[PDB]
């Protein structure tokens, strides 16, 4: 019962899994956003340039 | 391949229940990629996939 209550009332108990998920999500977001960079081109869109 | 008011993209347009604002025209997501468009011809919102 005590461990159940601690898990219910504590938000940092599952820090490891949430941190791993957040790291993966932010890595994916950074990879997606890297496309926005033009690297000297007029626009990042291949068709437009 | 949809060209809406100069915004060019490729995807499937489907009816959307999203509620835009009168001044709002385009849509975006967490990864700043186009997700919804308000057609100028008629007052409705179309998603992109
Ligand atoms: C989402 C929704 O309810 N849209 C309706 C639309 O279908 C209807 O044509 C209009 C008045 O006729 O009122 C609004
Ligand atoms: C922006 C918009 O809603 N435009 C339409 C127009 O294309 C249509 O001809 C008219 C019906 O008479 O209703 C309105």
From Swiss-Prot, chain A:
Q: What is the effect of changing residue 38 to K?
A: In strain: Omicron/BA.1, Omicron/BA.2, Omicron/BA.2.12.1, Omicron/BA.2.75, Omicron/BA.4, Omicron/BA.5, Omicron/BQ.1.1, Omicron/XBB.1.5, Omicron/EG.5.1
Where are the residues of the annotated region Heptad repeat 1? Answer: 1-39
Indicate the segments annotated as coiled coil, or none if absent: 18-49
Q: In UniProt terms, what function does this protein have? A: Subunit of the fusion protein that is processed upon entry into the host cell. Mediates fusion of the virion and cellular membranes by functioning as a class I viral fusion protein. Contains a viral fusion peptide that is unmasked after S2 cleavage. This cleavage can occur at the cell membrane by host TMPRSS2 or during endocytosis by host CSTL. In either case, this triggers an extensive and irreversible conformational change that leads to fusion of the viral envelope with the cellular cytoplasmic membrane, releasing viral genomic RNA into the host cell cytoplasm.
Protein's UniProt name: Spike protein S2'
